[PDB]
Amino acid sequence: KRIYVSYGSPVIDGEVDDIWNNVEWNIPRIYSATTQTNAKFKLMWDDNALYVLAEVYDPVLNSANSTPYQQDSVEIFLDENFDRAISYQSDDLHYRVNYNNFKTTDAGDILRFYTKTKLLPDGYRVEARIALSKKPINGTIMGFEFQVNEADSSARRVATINMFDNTGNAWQNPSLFGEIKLKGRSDNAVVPINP
Ligand SMILES: OC[C@H]1O[C@@H](O[C@@H]2[C@H](O)[C@@H](O)[C@H](O[C@H]3[C@H](O)[C@@H](O)[C@H](O)O[C@@H]3CO)O[C@@H]2CO)[C@H](O)[C@@H](O)[C@@H]1O
Ligand SMILES: [Ca+2]
Ligand SMILES: [Ca+2]
Ligand SMILES: [Ca+2]
Known part of the structure; x- marks a missing residue:
């Protein structure tokens, strides 16, 4: 399917900019197994970049395994030229x-x-x-x-x-x-300007 991404330019700091509240959550629903982990994410774009804000609900965080995808993490995939x-x-x-x-x-x-x-x-x-x-x-x-x-x-x-x-x-x-x-x-x- 398709997500429509609004234009905007957030600050990268782990904090939820005001402008992110003007955009809608995407709720990923394809689970490999049952779990009490869940997540949501918002997207935004500007002239130079795509922006992702993801929140994950996950009561146990672990990153002891040296294989990256075997740690609690998020992955982003982009096919830029489509x-x-x-x-x-x-x-x-x-x-x-x-x-x-x-x-x-x-x-x-x-x-x-x-x-x-x-x-x-x-x-x-x-x-x-x-x-x-x-x-x-x-x-x-x-x-x-x-x-x-x-x-x-x-x-x-x-x-x-x-x-x-x-x-x-x-x-x-x-x-x-x-x-x-x-x-x-x-x-x-x-x-x-207009003050
Ligand atoms: O017969 C099942 C075998 O599965 C093998 O694993 C692989 C592979 O070792 C990993 O590199 C690969 O990792 C990707 C993630 O699955 C994916 O979700 C993520 O986007 O990208 C990861 C980075 O490559 O995962 C598969 C497991 O699904 C095992 O290593 C073998 O022992 C198993 O027989
Ligand atoms: Ca921010
Ligand atoms: Ca976890
Ligand atoms: Ca491509």
Whole structure:
């Protein structure tokens, strides 16, 4: 399916900007197994970047396993050109950040990825920025996926939550991503002061 992404430019600090309250939560509902972990995320875009705000409810946080996706973490996938290829092209991105703000890339330049996390009672928040290589405009469509990895006290992933892919293959197959469509940038972006 498709998420419509509003235009805006948040501050990366792990805190919920005022402007994020003007955008809607996406609730990923594709669970690998039953768990009391759940998550939500908001998206926003500006001329230079896509922004993700994710909150995860997860009573046990673990990142003792040295394999990244075996820690409590979120993963963001982007098919920037909207090629929808079946394997990863040089513009396809797959990033991961754990609840301590440790970042990994499975695909794409990690210098494009900038994140903050915050520990919450019973969970964590991730606020992320991905620098875009193509100037986005109203109507731009990209492929996108969001995933949560749940780990437990044994230091292993026990479940995943996905927005769009129910097959376990987004890490190999961009055609499995959903779509985001960018809207809402005023054309006349010329703004006199007015105190
Ligand atoms: O027969 C089942 C076998 O599964 C193997 O595992 C792999 C592989 O080792 C991992 O690299 C891969 O990891 C990806 C996550 O599944 C995915 O959700 C995320 O987007 O991307 C991760 C980064 O690659 O996971 C699969 C497990 O599903 C086992 O290692 C074998 O022993 C098993 O037989
Ligand atoms: Ca913020
Ligand atoms: Ca692509
Ligand atoms: Ca956990």
